[PDB]
């Protein structure tokens, strides 16, 4: 049950955007939004 | 993600106000 | 962009000295005196505090939220 959460461009507010939907912020209304960090095991070696 | 209550967040009352 | 942690050539820790260097330069000291006041004998380690550019400030100016 993952609705593919996004981050607004300037609001930096979370939004829930599903397929076949316009790409806009829940408030104000902008056309830019980035994704959130994955949940995988991001493990680096301090080398 | 329906209702992540886990109780709640201290619900205010009507007569308390 | 940020003060390194160790002098490339020598290896002495220099990261923990940028703030002290700025403070000494601010109060009254000059560069030539502040370096040896902090304890940087070899000239290899002094370039860390003389040549280093501090761009993290310009980076932080672009605050994501608020």
């Amino acid at each position: 049950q993952q609705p593919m959460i996004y981050i607004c461009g300037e609001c930096h507010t979370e939004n829930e955007i599903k397929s076949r939907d316009p790409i806009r912020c829940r408030e104000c209304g902008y056309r830019i939004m980035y994704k959130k960090r994955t949940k995988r095991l991001v493990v680096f070696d301090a080398r | 993600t329906s209702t992540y209550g886990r109780y709640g967040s201290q619900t205010p009352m009507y007569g308390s106000g | 962009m940020i003060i390194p942690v160790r002098c490339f050539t020598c290896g002495k820790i220099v990261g923990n000295k940028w703030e002290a260097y700025l403070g000494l330069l601010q109060a009254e000291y000059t560069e030539g005196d502040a370096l040896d006041a902090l304890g940087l004998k070899r000239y290899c380690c002094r370039r860390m505090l003389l040549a280093h550019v501090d761009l993290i400030e310009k980076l932080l100016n672009y605050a994501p939220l608020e």
Binding site: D21, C25, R26, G29 | S2, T3, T11, P12, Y14 | -
Partner: protein, 139 residues
């Protein structure tokens, strides 16, 4: 039964996702909420309609000034969405609500009524925002 009646209970976490969605006087009208009166006693009330209060308050992250015209048998007054509790209808409160309905004379809604009304929230939750509602929401 209380377990069957808790199905349409609109908790405080669900109402935060329809603060500006249209058809709020259609999908909401019919469900019951555990409005807190205030000491731990609660009274279930019927959702007669939707109103708008002149006081603006913040509820956690979002903020809304809409009211909720409720009624418990005969006693009716304006309420707010911030006093609603997330607890389910207990046995004592269920009996109190049944007694209040019987005293007020309002016929108890039929089980098929609740059965066909609980699906309204479910179908509205997965509603695709393909129409021109985002503009009104942002405004």
């Amino acid at each position: 039964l209380p377990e069957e009646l808790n199905r349409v209970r609109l908790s405080r976490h669900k109402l935060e996702r329809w603060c500006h969605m249209p058809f709020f006087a259609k999908t909401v009208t019919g469900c019951f909420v555990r409005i807190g009166i205030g000491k731990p006693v609660y009274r279930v009330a019927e959702i007669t309609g939707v109103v708008e209060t002149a006081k603006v308050y913040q509820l956690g992250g979002t903020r809304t000034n809409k009211g909720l015209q409720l009624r418990h048998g005969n006693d009716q007054r304006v309420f707010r969405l911030e006093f609603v509790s997330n607890q389910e209808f207990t046995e004592s409160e269920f009996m109190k609500w049944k007694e209040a309905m019987f005293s007020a004379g309002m016929q108890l809604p039929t089980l098929d009524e609740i059965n066909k009304k609980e699906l309204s929230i479910k179908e509205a939750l997965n509603y695709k925002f393909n129409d021109q509602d985002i503009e009104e929401i942002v405004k």
